[PDB]
Subunit: 486 residues, 3 copies
């Protein structure tokens, strides 16, 4: 035979993967990678973030100084983990705007407390209760000071505490709501008391409401917790005629990246930057389906449980070229040559075109994988109580956010996959045209991805075509003689 065949082709695999594009919902590619993190280890890694396990204590109980929370005194955290088993074991209390106090302490990230010498002359300090046992002693919240009558007298208190420092001061104080009038008059001589806590710019007044309350841990009395922030150069001024649960000092309030999370996941010895209530998750992938509640450098939450990014070309199950099919038998390259000549048949991968496609697919992998982590503060996203307007707005904000990011994730994968298909198809065409330019007038396109070479073309000659060193002039006379005969 005075001719040879040179076919251009691409590889194929027996186990393709379905992905989505702009055109079709399901197209098979040779390989893909998952972009949605859907699994967790189940453990909260104690590195690199400072994790603080609240165990039996809520953050507020550790703030007030519930006795079984004494170990939390002056503690700091990057992430405070509140357990569902936590409980209160001191004086029954409520906190108006509980969520806001819990949030502002959590964000501050410290329970550092500085005692201050308040001048409570005329009243008895450190009132206790059998409902707040600390060891063998009736006691009280470690950071609050229960004031009451001294010598059957409760003089009007007018006590000041200036902030001469360079930091903000967080003062926690309260008001005692006795259950009976006798109880009211025994502790505070008057049948009713008043508290005004003021600064240069603010004032807070609260009236105790004597009366029976539903029984909670052996009492029908209550304490209401309030807070006051005193800026540097401002002054705390306390006026009371009874029922004041006084502060023993202030908490340092700092600005930082700390937060709080509800979780029953065990704390483990490992390292992971992203934390969810289900446990830590890796943050290599750009999206995650584990939990919309996150802490740290985290993939963005989406509704999809899987989004596959194509990392290879379309998978397509005498000799023939790429127009017909792909080559499962080609394992050492993505594109290559098959030939038939006087020496038989052969196959060789084209490394340069293979690397050009691989470099682009790895290129888009870096862009899709590095424009990734959400890294700012998080509102609450789960609610135990029905609250109306503001809770509705929080849910609406989070739902709007998730739908937009789910849309972004869906579009990104479809656009990226369409481009991956296009670029891998383009490399095939570029190799074919490159080969056709080499052959000049010595070959004809058979239309199936193969060239009919109109001269004797041994393996070294075929190698020169794969080489880019084929000299068409050497064979032109023979080839034109074979092509243009009658």
């Amino acid at each position: 035979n005075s001719t040879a065949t040179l076919c251009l082709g691409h590889h194929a695999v027996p186990n393709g993967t379905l992905v989505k594009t702009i055109t079709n919902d399901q197209i098979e590619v040779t390989n893909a990678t998952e972009l949605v993190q859907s699994s967790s280890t189940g453990r909260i890694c104690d590195s690199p973030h400072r994790i603080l396990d609240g165990k039996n204590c809520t953050l507020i109980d550790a703030l007030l100084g519930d006795p079984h929370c004494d170990g939390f005194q002056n503690e700091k955290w990057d992430l405070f983990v509140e357990r569902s088993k936590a409980f209160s074991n001191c004086y029954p209390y409520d906190v108006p705007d509980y969520a806001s106090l819990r949030s502002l302490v959590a964000s501050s990230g410290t329970l550092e407390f500085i005692n201050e010498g308040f001048n409570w002359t005329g009243v008895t300090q450190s009132g206790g209760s059998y409902t707040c046992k600390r060891g063998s002693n009736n006691s009280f919240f470690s950071r609050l000071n229960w004031l009451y009558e001294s010598e059957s007298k409760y003089p009007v208190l007018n006590v000041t505490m200036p902030n001469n420092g360079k930091f903000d001061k967080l003062y926690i104080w309260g008001i005692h709501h006795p259950s009976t009038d006798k109880e009211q008059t025994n502790l505070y001589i008057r049948a009713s008391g008043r508290v005004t806590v003021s600064t240069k710019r603010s004032q807070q007044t609260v009236i105790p409401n004597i009366g029976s309350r539903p029984w909670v841990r052996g009492l029908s009395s209550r304490i209401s917790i309030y807070w006051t922030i005193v800026k540097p150069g401002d002054i705390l001024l306390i006026n009371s005629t009874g029922n004041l649960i006084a502060p023993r000092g202030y908490f340092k309030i700092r600005t930082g990246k700390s937060s709080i999370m509800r979780s029953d996941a065990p704390i483990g010895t490992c390292s992971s930057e992203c934390i969810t209530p289900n446990g830590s998750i890796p943050n290599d992938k750009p999206f995650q389906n584990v939990n919309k509640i996150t802490y740290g450098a985290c993939p963005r939450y989406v509704k999809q449980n899987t989004l596959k990014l194509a990392t290879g070309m379309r998978n397509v199950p005498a000799i023939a070229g790429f127009i017909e099919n792909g080559w499962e038998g080609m394992v050492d390259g993505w594109y290559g040559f098959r030939h038939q000549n006087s020496e038989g048949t052969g196959q060789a991968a084209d490394l340069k075109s293979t690397q050009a496609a691989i470099d682009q697919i790895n290129g888009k992998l870096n862009r899709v994988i590095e424009k990734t982590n959400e890294k700012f503060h998080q509102i609450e996203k789960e609610f135990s109580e029905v609250e109306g307007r503001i809770q509705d707005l929080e849910k609406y904000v989070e739902d709007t956010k998730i739908d937009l990011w789910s849309y972004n994730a869906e579009l990104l994968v479809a656009l990226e996959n369409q481009h991956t298909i296009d670029l891998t198809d383009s490399e095939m065409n570029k190799l074919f045209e490159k080969t056709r330019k080499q052959l000049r007038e010595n070959a004809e396109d058979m239309g199936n991805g193969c060239f009919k070479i109109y001269h004797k073309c041994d393996n070294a000659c075929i190698g020169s075509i794969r080489n880019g060193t084929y000299d068409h002039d050497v064979y032109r006379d023979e080839a034109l003689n074979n092509r243009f005969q009658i």
Copy 2:
């Protein structure tokens, strides 16, 4: 040395449509479809959602038990429709945080009420008023209990009601603000009263303010409405020495997909999943411009009133010529096809396979644009009757931010999709041309206008063999090479 011409082309229409792409603001295509729902029937369909027309009653008036709202007792709804003509015809009242009470009742979706036996020994029950007529006699809110003196005595009430069930209880109660001291002392012996309603985790104390308020429906007194939710295992405790408007029981409070909408649109007999204050709208399209207030499975609201998605190729208005120059208005039975000119005359034939390939891809993207579409969650309020400050600004800002982002998404999506449709329909034309040139081998030359000069005798059957893909170039190669390569 006879020859023939075979031209490749695509169709064109006289009435094209302008669409947008990544490049141009206006490019004419053969066909397009609208993606923004911009019209409504004006009618609220009563299916498949349970619609409840409030008619003359607000949701709160039906909750409290205004006499002309008695027909709303124990009713449920998926969507409560409040009319602008609604009015109150009972005791003048106000509700601190009205919007929150209205919202949580609306979301619960039921006015189911369970009477309970409270112990009001020592006081007179069921106080009435002439401004709240029921039938012929002075009456009051059906679900509220006006307590006052018994035998010139109002003992300190200390009444309990445990929650021993497995669901939450919503208690509606109130406080009477008399206009004069005589009124205060006649009904409630002391010159001032107190109310404390508490649970294990909450307590609410409110002080009546005796005095005249502006005249409303014949009275200068007021009732202030409050509410309390009691969890299972918790206990309601009521302590009062006067002015208490007592509850007669609790409302069931549920968690579900119910809501409330202000609208004057009539309710109709039809079926439609998306409801807006303008009426029901179809939800086939991905976007809508009718109203940012929606209920049900609805297209997403965008600022654009039209977004046209290309569903055909670019529209482009004696020898024959191919696709390079123009399109073929005379081709009606296909999108791509052939024209030939040979010894037997001229002819035209559509290529069915390549036409379907284009249509299949365009229908493919039509599905993707339409299937990832409906918003399916709860909606905050988006219109406001009073100017309120911080929280209302944030609600408006959230909604404005959302709409701008979805408007951007819709604009980009249509421009990308249209660019791809133009590109794929152009590609099908080029692939059909390349497919033909591969068949002809050395028997033809590209004339540069979308046509081939075939350098051999090429009768109608021979032309048909090229369109059919069965043309054998070897049969004609000798004749063709002789015609091509002469001096």
Copy 3:
């Protein structure tokens, strides 16, 4: 000698610019434009928006009528600019909902005040203080009326003011908190006063708290500011037994595009639609990095400090064609021809293909640049105090928004640049194919972007190829003779 060479090419520049695409993080193009506004002039332009410089006055002090703010009476604004140097110099006061009042007045855009004749029979009007000097005399807030005892009597007030107009009325009023019981009884006979301000649909009751507050400008007393909006057809009813700081009328409350901004930037005589606290910025570009706080028609805020949009093709620094190289020596076009023939060598730009590429790039420039400005009202985005739940939600919404727009901006530039690279490559190939179709059998593709023309091809013949009027039949006999020799 009896042949010619015709090469197809595109231009190149020595100083390319790096942009991003879908594939690579850094690809050099001939030209690009910046999409992120990152600089400000430092000046707030007084046009075309009505700027009102508060100078020494906060908006609230101008509202109440602090004497050194008398010049702001009845003033209007599009944007009120509050300075950090502002101060109060009247009676010490607080506003329980300061931020909300400041916001609704700012949004209304006017301090227009309508005096009304209230019936204060039985009390003395226009109470003053030495802490609020107007000229040289004890005075008070210009818009408030300090009522107190007349003839050692303070009768119970029951005063009405109906709204019979067609607009809403904003009433600003207050309550006096005396520091001692002596002040309380001297001004108001009773040891305590009560105020109820009501309408058909609302009622507000407030109790003074007698007692010492921290020293502010020589006094320990306070005024608490409250407000009431009265709709058309509604009625204001004021009931007082002491301590009432009465309104002298109402402020007009309008609905419009006005707002308030904190800034120390100087106000300028210039024109700029977009204002930031750093100063006015141009709004030609679609995005900006200057400040998330904006007023007017503004580019959207993004985290990126630069986003470069390609406005030219990839930059690729005898004769050869585009397969190898770009042509830095081609300055008058984007694509063109280089030839070698019997009359010498030459270069010519192809205007049609250059304009086709430029028109597509200018076309996408309009779409990227014209659909751009945010044109609605803005929440607060910086906070002086630590506040809890609602502030967290405000921060979270703004952070969510900025990340979404930052993502949109990144994806848009990557897609646009990929398409710009692709469309400019396509124009080069289309020009090459157009030339190849013209030449028919008279030339062969040399594989480097050049044609070998197998006939004598003078300057006029080359011109006919570039003009699209080359007649291949004229030269086909000569060309076939040179090509097909054996």
